[PDB]
RNA sequence: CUAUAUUCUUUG
RNA sequence: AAAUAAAUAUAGUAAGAUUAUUUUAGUAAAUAUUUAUUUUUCUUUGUA
């Protein structure tokens, strides 16, 4: 019947638009891997079967596995473009991705030096912490002050028992 | 053996051509021109009556003698209207009393 | 059904999902021929005409005869009684409101406006209540 | 005529701001996305079509 | 296709510093030299961690080059022009 | 209505129309077959302008060709539709092309029937054209009984 | 039992052996004595900062509206929000600025969070809707199957006639009364409800959960989630070096893996993704708080061989963000790619919510500048979306000479003539006396 | 048909005079939203039509080159979902590009009639509470719009200030030194 | 209820 | 007609069962659930 075939691949990721009613709250370390196996084999099984069925069916009808007949067979010999809208091929869609990535990596070199150019410059201005260091309103976190230690020239994490207000 | 049971015989939307495309490939310009070039001269579109509802609506693409197929004829006509290809054949006539 | 049962260990029947009734099943047309409902939201009469008519007209009087040509609200028991058949689509949905006699435009459009129908270009924006498309001048069902 | 305060036969005006300054209203009320003011009149137990209402 | 429209897309490298502030001084993504595909690593010089590496998971044995979508760059074709390809006999 | 509005809807009430027109606005009463609705609400689906049906008969009487509702076919009615064929006689007026040349009924049986019709109904001007004695009582042929013009 | 019922108060003696354990037990010293565990409020989880360490600038206090930076601090680089910030209904109405952590656990540049996302102030009914959705959804619905009266396999005949015996009146005894029997109306998957949940509610509830994680000071923002190798001990090396507690007993980490500031991805980082299966309490989820609309193609009864549940046939998949797995794992680790993607998908949503006298000022303030129209230079997108975009940049050239061109449809309107045909109702388009319009096929 | 700003086909047949309209300045702010989320959509169609497999488990790894869509389906997805989405986006673009042509004219007419200052001051949509939605720190003394109404600086006096002290002997625990209130337990 | 009454009126 | 195998026929004048105390408003017309009205006096009144 009508099970919404057109929404099958519509989803952004591989795991959606799939009726998954066999599941649990907590998924273990290998149940999660099982889940990620099930989903991608749900896509792959259903795609490869739909490839096989039509390739076999096109072969049984005496034409090319594509569904591309004798006429279109002649057009490719004569060098004629055989269809109206030549959609991007596999190799193309891989190439896009890698060119995008190869832009991003270069940019992540340049940003690295940019930020390292700034950070050393506003460290030399600030050996002492600014007006965020005040716990007048509420206590500082020693969990976080161990992380902020490196920038400053002083010992931050040594905190008096008494609350410190604009402490020196 | 029943290759299609009563329910999927009952659905005439799939079978008949209402609101449904019956030719699923779309040809480029120099493809359409070659396809039109294989039509024998002295052929009118008006000589190809639209088949009844009983007959399934389908198009085998461009095969030999594709102009005998009604739906192929007119689907090709639509691509020729989109691509700006001149249509050599006639057009469908409406006879009246 | 116990891990000992000779009953269940030999398979007999397997029960399926049971089909639901027509959503409009209870709006029966013998009501829709007789009455019509009139009202502002939250108060609505069902109104009908009187039968004394088609047996003896003559001899009685003109006033008692034309007391028959007025629309009149049905007795409230009967209205509740007929309305009750329209209330059985959702029990325990207290936030709902009963179905009307004649389907309004919202109630026609509600069945095509879902996110399950949005790809169906049949039956969209109402179809079956419009007159049919002129068929191809050579159209024939044989 | 100005653009914000235009003539409208229905009548609609963007919020005018507080009628007195130097004073703070403890609450703030948002118009809807269509410009409607928040009060909604429902019915308590709409299934039986009770005349009893609320806001 | 020469520089793409998106090659001018704005990213903030450092606050107050944009990648479009360099302008050609713009990164054209297709003109970035493609690194050659890395295959699986050669087995270590030692039998022990060779056997232990061979003992690993199929997931841990996945070679990583790009890291995203094709993991390993595809090699460029032998011809830079589409009609530069020799046409055999049909 | 303070500002002018230009709007295309179907079957507006008279007061709404005069309220729009007083402002210096516009109203055009479009009336569409179902296909028309789907083609306006989903324009993207159809690349070329496609041949669109005229709405049906009763709707053409009451809406599309109505100057009061300001339908869109009023020009078409006042230019093309309201005139008969240039050759056509009075009896054959409604036909697209006159079926015969001579306006006089061309069959002796049809002539006998027209004589009987003209003595049936008494002799009124329109009696020449045969109208059948029996009716449909169907809603697709009925028009307005009485109302403001 | 119940507090009122007389069964309560039983066992007047014997509940405690009267004698101390000589290791753990002690006397109450006095008012100067600090008792382990004792607190004036009803804490079902009495965790302090030592057991469940919170990472934020300040320990959350009633004086602080949120435990993060309210102003960009002069000693670190400050990155502004990806999209411009608008304050909607439930938003905190105060500037939320969070530090970013490197993978070496030092603090790196500071980044401003979006109060529409991380500021939607939690109220409990919404989170309730979220939680009940997740716990009803996450059952195994295939296990709800049970036998029924017609499913028993006995003889259908009256087993003894009811006339003269003192025996009960019994026939076809496959009923629910009997030890071998089955019920009249049993439970079984196609009768079990799977709840439908619309995007508005999911979006709102997840926003409020993120905000709740901010207010509890348990939110962490990281550059990348990236491992040297796909192996597990690299992952544990990471979790150990930057102080994530992944032990089952300890409070876990909930990852939103986005890529980085510069290169965000919708897909997980492969290297990190394979190392991320540790047996402990941790979960890696998709970088989205939205959800696809849930469609029901049996809403009436129609398809009977459906096994299924009754309800939405498109339940939210398990690797999304939710209330349950937020409440289980304490630290919420969000990559900046995830931040960018969240803001990107929620932008239009927040714009529509605003009152109309406010949405009119959006273009004036430059909120609505659009790359498509080309008033600005295009914005930062993910890897996949840049791929798709360049794909369309590439394929826009095949539609030029065709009349069905999407990028210039109906260019022929304002030179066009229209002609009403009277022989059969049709309105046909004409240009230069040629009929342009296409009569539809059936 | 309709769907642009000009008019439908049945007004051309109707011959209604739509041409000399009065031009007013309408920011077209709603359409920019719809355009943002249309252009957001088109790209998604291009992405999900162009998925190809990368399978990370070995059993499913025989398919890793192929598109996730069957070609026959990928074509149909290109016709039905994708290239008509471009048309929707296209329509929004047209309806805005008309109106910048119109708004330019309104601005010029008002610049001549008024002068740049007066004109630009009239063509501003500023509402007195626009600071409530944009920079609330300028709005705080006007109304209390916070979800925390007890932490707004006007009502801030209500929340208590504890006297708290850290403890080394408890392990870095901060603790409030305030005495508890004795409670009513009995009647 | 079905038939005969077909204008504001009429049968079993 | 008998036996064997399949069904869920119907049974308020045939019937029988129906699973969790310490409770918080009364007795068409009645009763029950949800809900509504501060309509005038010396006191009093469950009306809808
Ligand atoms: N109810 C309908 O008939 C209906 C509904 C929605 C859309 N449409 C659109 O109406 C137009 C024609 O409909 P029809 O039924 O008269 O013919 P059709 O669509 O049944 O057949 C048209 C022929 O031209 C092909 N074609 C369609 N779009 C094409 C394109 N954009 N480029 C190249 N070839 C294309 C079709 O696949 C087929 O080969 C098409 O845009 C169709 O999609 C029609």
mmCIF file of C-alpha atoms in Angstrom, chain F residues 1-113:
data_model
loop_
_atom_site.group_PDB
_atom_site.id
_atom_site.type_symbol
_atom_site.label_atom_id
_atom_site.label_comp_id
_atom_site.label_asym_id
_atom_site.label_seq_id
_atom_site.Cartn_x
_atom_site.Cartn_y
_atom_site.Cartn_z
ATOM 1 C CA UNK F 1 -10.589 51.383 3.291
ATOM 2 C CA UNK F 2 -7.980 54.137 3.681
ATOM 3 C CA UNK F 3 -5.389 53.092 1.079
ATOM 4 C CA UNK F 4 -6.053 51.578 -2.341
ATOM 5 C CA UNK F 5 -5.940 47.778 -2.613
ATOM 6 C CA UNK F 6 -5.596 45.689 -5.743
ATOM 7 C CA UNK F 7 -7.039 42.263 -5.180
ATOM 8 C CA UNK F 8 -8.215 39.211 -7.091
ATOM 9 C CA UNK F 9 -10.637 36.979 -5.222
ATOM 10 C CA UNK F 10 -13.852 35.161 -5.987
ATOM 11 C CA UNK F 11 -17.412 36.328 -5.393
ATOM 12 C CA UNK F 12 -17.008 39.323 -3.085
ATOM 13 C CA UNK F 13 -20.057 40.877 -1.452
ATOM 14 C CA UNK F 14 -21.308 44.165 -2.915
ATOM 15 C CA UNK F 15 -20.343 46.261 0.113
ATOM 16 C CA UNK F 16 -16.770 44.975 0.119
ATOM 17 C CA UNK F 17 -16.510 45.802 -3.573
ATOM 18 C CA UNK F 18 -17.800 49.348 -3.121
ATOM 19 C CA UNK F 19 -15.558 49.791 -0.087
ATOM 20 C CA UNK F 20 -12.568 48.848 -2.205
ATOM 21 C CA UNK F 21 -13.644 50.955 -5.175
ATOM 22 C CA UNK F 22 -14.249 54.067 -3.050
ATOM 23 C CA UNK F 23 -10.610 54.034 -1.994
ATOM 24 C CA UNK F 24 -9.522 54.016 -5.610
ATOM 25 C CA UNK F 25 -8.707 50.330 -5.407
ATOM 26 C CA UNK F 26 -9.509 47.359 -7.622
ATOM 27 C CA UNK F 27 -11.433 44.119 -7.566
ATOM 28 C CA UNK F 28 -11.539 41.405 -10.160
ATOM 29 C CA UNK F 29 -13.716 38.469 -9.456
ATOM 30 C CA UNK F 30 -11.817 35.492 -10.711
ATOM 31 C CA UNK F 31 -13.678 32.244 -10.826
ATOM 32 C CA UNK F 32 -11.800 29.039 -11.316
ATOM 33 C CA UNK F 33 -12.331 25.420 -12.162
ATOM 34 C CA UNK F 34 -10.586 23.118 -9.681
ATOM 35 C CA UNK F 35 -7.605 22.753 -12.031
ATOM 36 C CA UNK F 36 -7.310 26.532 -11.871
ATOM 37 C CA UNK F 37 -7.040 26.442 -8.091
ATOM 38 C CA UNK F 38 -4.328 23.819 -8.177
ATOM 39 C CA UNK F 39 -2.458 25.720 -10.897
ATOM 40 C CA UNK F 40 -2.509 29.011 -9.030
ATOM 41 C CA UNK F 41 -1.683 27.559 -5.631
ATOM 42 C CA UNK F 42 1.154 25.481 -7.077
ATOM 43 C CA UNK F 43 2.560 27.558 -9.940
ATOM 44 C CA UNK F 44 6.041 26.044 -9.758
ATOM 45 C CA UNK F 45 4.882 22.681 -11.048
ATOM 46 C CA UNK F 46 3.901 23.988 -14.484
ATOM 47 C CA UNK F 47 6.734 25.628 -16.478
ATOM 48 C CA UNK F 48 4.645 26.803 -19.467
ATOM 49 C CA UNK F 49 1.318 28.604 -19.323
ATOM 50 C CA UNK F 50 -1.125 25.810 -20.069
ATOM 51 C CA UNK F 51 -4.588 25.928 -21.588
ATOM 52 C CA UNK F 52 -6.992 26.595 -18.808
ATOM 53 C CA UNK F 53 -10.656 25.694 -18.828
ATOM 54 C CA UNK F 54 -13.427 28.222 -18.744
ATOM 55 C CA UNK F 55 -15.467 27.713 -15.564
ATOM 56 C CA UNK F 56 -18.843 25.975 -15.966
ATOM 57 C CA UNK F 57 -22.152 27.414 -17.128
ATOM 58 C CA UNK F 58 -23.933 28.508 -13.946
ATOM 59 C CA UNK F 59 -20.710 30.095 -12.687
ATOM 60 C CA UNK F 60 -20.317 31.902 -16.018
ATOM 61 C CA UNK F 61 -23.807 33.339 -15.697
ATOM 62 C CA UNK F 62 -23.482 34.406 -12.074
ATOM 63 C CA UNK F 63 -19.810 35.285 -11.568
ATOM 64 C CA UNK F 64 -17.329 35.476 -14.463
ATOM 65 C CA UNK F 65 -19.585 37.453 -16.830
ATOM 66 C CA UNK F 66 -21.289 39.507 -14.059
ATOM 67 C CA UNK F 67 -20.528 43.265 -14.075
ATOM 68 C CA UNK F 68 -21.981 43.566 -10.572
ATOM 69 C CA UNK F 69 -19.446 41.154 -9.084
ATOM 70 C CA UNK F 70 -16.971 42.473 -11.646
ATOM 71 C CA UNK F 71 -16.024 39.117 -13.082
ATOM 72 C CA UNK F 72 -13.162 38.783 -15.513
ATOM 73 C CA UNK F 73 -15.082 37.615 -18.581
ATOM 74 C CA UNK F 74 -17.269 40.734 -18.843
ATOM 75 C CA UNK F 75 -15.188 42.140 -21.715
ATOM 76 C CA UNK F 76 -15.317 38.750 -23.420
ATOM 77 C CA UNK F 77 -19.076 38.664 -22.979
ATOM 78 C CA UNK F 78 -19.527 42.236 -24.236
ATOM 79 C CA UNK F 79 -17.268 41.734 -27.232
ATOM 80 C CA UNK F 80 -17.353 38.108 -28.364
ATOM 81 C CA UNK F 81 -20.088 36.052 -26.579
ATOM 82 C CA UNK F 82 -23.242 38.212 -26.697
ATOM 83 C CA UNK F 83 -23.214 38.394 -30.494
ATOM 84 C CA UNK F 84 -24.506 35.470 -32.549
ATOM 85 C CA UNK F 85 -23.011 34.174 -35.783
ATOM 86 C CA UNK F 86 -23.085 36.793 -38.574
ATOM 87 C CA UNK F 87 -24.993 34.514 -40.922
ATOM 88 C CA UNK F 88 -27.278 33.059 -38.258
ATOM 89 C CA UNK F 89 -31.028 33.372 -38.289
ATOM 90 C CA UNK F 90 -33.088 33.807 -35.150
ATOM 91 C CA UNK F 91 -33.889 30.114 -34.651
ATOM 92 C CA UNK F 92 -30.325 29.036 -35.291
ATOM 93 C CA UNK F 93 -28.894 31.908 -33.259
ATOM 94 C CA UNK F 94 -27.593 29.774 -30.425
ATOM 95 C CA UNK F 95 -25.710 27.344 -32.670
ATOM 96 C CA UNK F 96 -22.001 27.944 -33.209
ATOM 97 C CA UNK F 97 -22.432 27.599 -36.946
ATOM 98 C CA UNK F 98 -25.882 27.554 -38.533
ATOM 99 C CA UNK F 99 -26.758 23.919 -39.268
ATOM 100 C CA UNK F 100 -28.683 24.846 -42.392
ATOM 101 C CA UNK F 101 -28.825 27.924 -44.575
ATOM 102 C CA UNK F 102 -32.504 28.828 -44.392
ATOM 103 C CA UNK F 103 -33.858 29.922 -41.007
ATOM 104 C CA UNK F 104 -37.222 28.227 -41.674
ATOM 105 C CA UNK F 105 -37.566 24.745 -40.167
ATOM 106 C CA UNK F 106 -36.215 22.403 -42.832
ATOM 107 C CA UNK F 107 -38.137 19.227 -41.985
ATOM 108 C CA UNK F 108 -41.839 18.699 -42.656
ATOM 109 C CA UNK F 109 -42.100 16.859 -39.338
ATOM 110 C CA UNK F 110 -40.255 19.636 -37.548
ATOM 111 C CA UNK F 111 -42.525 22.144 -39.272
ATOM 112 C CA UNK F 112 -45.647 20.269 -38.190
ATOM 113 C CA UNK F 113 -44.221 20.239 -34.669
#
